[PDB]
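During the second year of the project, the team shifted from modelling isolated chains to modelling whole assemblies. The rationale, set out in the original proposal, was that interfaces cannot be judged from single-chain predictions alone. As a representative example for this report, we include one of the complexes processed in the last quarter. Its constituent sequences, exactly as entered into the pipeline, are reproduced here:
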Amino acid sequence: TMVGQICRYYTQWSGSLKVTFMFTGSFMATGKMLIAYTPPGSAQPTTREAAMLGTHIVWDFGLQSSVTLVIPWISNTHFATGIVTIWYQTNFVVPPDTPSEANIIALGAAQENFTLKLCKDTDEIRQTAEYQ
Amino acid sequence: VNEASVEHFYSRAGLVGVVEVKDSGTSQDGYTVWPIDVMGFVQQRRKLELSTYMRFDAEFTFVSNLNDSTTPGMLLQYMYVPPGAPKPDGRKSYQWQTATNPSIFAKLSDPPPQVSVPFMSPASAYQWFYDGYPTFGEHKQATNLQYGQCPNNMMGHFAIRTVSESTTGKNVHVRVYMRIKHVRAWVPRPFRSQAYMVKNYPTYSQTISNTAADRASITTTDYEGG
Amino acid sequence: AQLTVGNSTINIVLSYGEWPGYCPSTDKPTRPDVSVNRFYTLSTKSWKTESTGWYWKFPDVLNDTGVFGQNAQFHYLYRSGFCMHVQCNASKFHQGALLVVVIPEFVVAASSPATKPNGQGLYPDFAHTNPGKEGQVFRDPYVLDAGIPLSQALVFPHQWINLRTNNCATIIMPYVNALPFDSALNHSNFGLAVIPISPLKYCNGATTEVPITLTIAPLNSEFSGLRQ
Amino acid sequence: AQLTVGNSTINIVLSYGEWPGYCPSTDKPTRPDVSVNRFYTLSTKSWKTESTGWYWKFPDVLNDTGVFGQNAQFHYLYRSGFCMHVQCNASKFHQGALLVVVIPEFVVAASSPATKPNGQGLYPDFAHTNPGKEGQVFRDPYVLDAGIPLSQALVFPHQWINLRTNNCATIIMPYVNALPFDSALNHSNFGLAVIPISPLKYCNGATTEVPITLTIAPLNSEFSGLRQ
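Output from the structure prediction step:
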């Protein structure tokens, strides 16, 4: 993401993120997924019924192609944080003569209250070769 | 439009149960208790099960005579044992006296006795459909006995004796007629479509009686009916 | 095109024309509001050709589930309604019809095994009386596992799901009882029956299982007598 | 349900929130208006399973085409924007997604052939730098034939084509440069990349090729220094 590259030039950040999903399957396909968010200090939900509990959105392929999930109150300050799991709620329903396998695309971005501080230099560009 | 009211549909006192006070044969202990079931006969059992909840007052009438139809001026005692009291163990039992235990002394020669019972349930209405279990008794292994039974529907008892020290040689036949009055009902049900088996439980058999009749083909209406 | 209550995301038949309220001050209970008021989406039933149906018992289905299930098995008294939403995800090439019906005081029955004088006690086991979250399958859907016929079940609050027409159904059920409060563990107030009246049919190369989905929201819940 | 400009027939993303105008009297050019302002519908790209993508260079694609191409290769200075409309004709049974993105100053790069000290000059040929009307195919779409990653290409003006959702996309691009006027032949201001993010998939007995179509309209063009 652009957020993940642009927050690696800074030491500390805080704010909210949003994560959008987009379903690329065929127009005739239907189904439901369960998109759950797990707050910090908790482990990954073991089963769907554990994830069915709070902070989830059940998302139908037929009705909407896209859906959005907001992540509150993120901060890195230190020295398990957050987990988003996607569960099959029902099954993937398909008519005849249409593909049975589809794809989902995950988008993400900061929101208005996101902030950055204490600019540092990134570690991705190291590139020990001196010819550059 | 008035003849279709639930007030009119539940009216017109019918025969609830018959009971026989036996002084004659091997028995020779004159008295009987009677539960006041109201569902005893299968045909009124349907009409009451039309609704889920019912609230009504009852009016009981006692028609009594001998084996042959005769009325030789005996005295009887109609003891109404309300819910939560004990029941006479015998004809001379101390519980026939008491108080708070209404009695009717009427001679056979008289007109039949007539009494009204108010609405006695702890809840706000009677219910003959109760899902779940009345109590916590449970570590059951598998024992399903008490499912569906509700304590709240018990109305009284009637105990009748011949009011005689020595044993009479007469058998008295008592017919009980009850008239539902001031009736309200809630949550209509469908009519029972199968044959009843047990009195208190809604159990049916594995040979399923069809709801409608049969005919030859879906097109022709010719013979019999359909 | 969506609606959310209490970090839970996801026409209407109003049972007996009355909207569930609270009881008055008479005639100090605890009102959780949106903590226990949310959408519980339970598991998914695969509907097949030659499937008889399913049923639930509503104070019962949530006894083991989540926060509502905590309060239920610890407070002594219970009152609430429910908003129940049954969705079916199918394709324009599937056909069939579902009858969704809310049966107050639905009392399961047992069937006598053919030849027998049939006087002995027969009785539904605890699995059939309290199916839990998984629901229970009709062995005989034509009589509704009771004496009443299916064809007259339409007298109860109901709605049709016809796959060619709408695929969703929503029933709001007020609290119905003979008492103001009652026991959530022992007593079951009603149940849903999802019955495939017209069977399911499709052609080769399509999806066999069609996923019926059930989502239930408590409404105006209140509790009394909290134990440990 | 159609619109026409200059005997040419045939939601909107406005790049950087600015509508293309003319430059002021400062800071005598010729303004052709509807003569060169019309819809140029170039050829059609068949999109397949296992297709990487395509790209164009917009002052370049029209250099050989029509009236705009005449003025371009004869006037010395050039300025204009573009209204670019990408359509995809597919069926409700096809699935896939296209990312249409406008990259300002898109500069193609060359890849070093695996093992080599890699100090020698490598350089894209003239076919890849000026693909012409036929466009050019990405050899490596994941890096956009440059160093930048595809996943961040969304920072440019873009739009999604999701076959189950809308099949069309329209991007209006104002004139962007460091100079008021520039050379249409040498300098390429931007380019479109049509990249199949989610691949194309269908079932046997359907149409293999799905015809991506590109239609581009110059906007507020102006020229200077006309030669023979």
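Residues 66-72 of chain C form the longest helix (7 residues). Chain C has three helices and ten strands.
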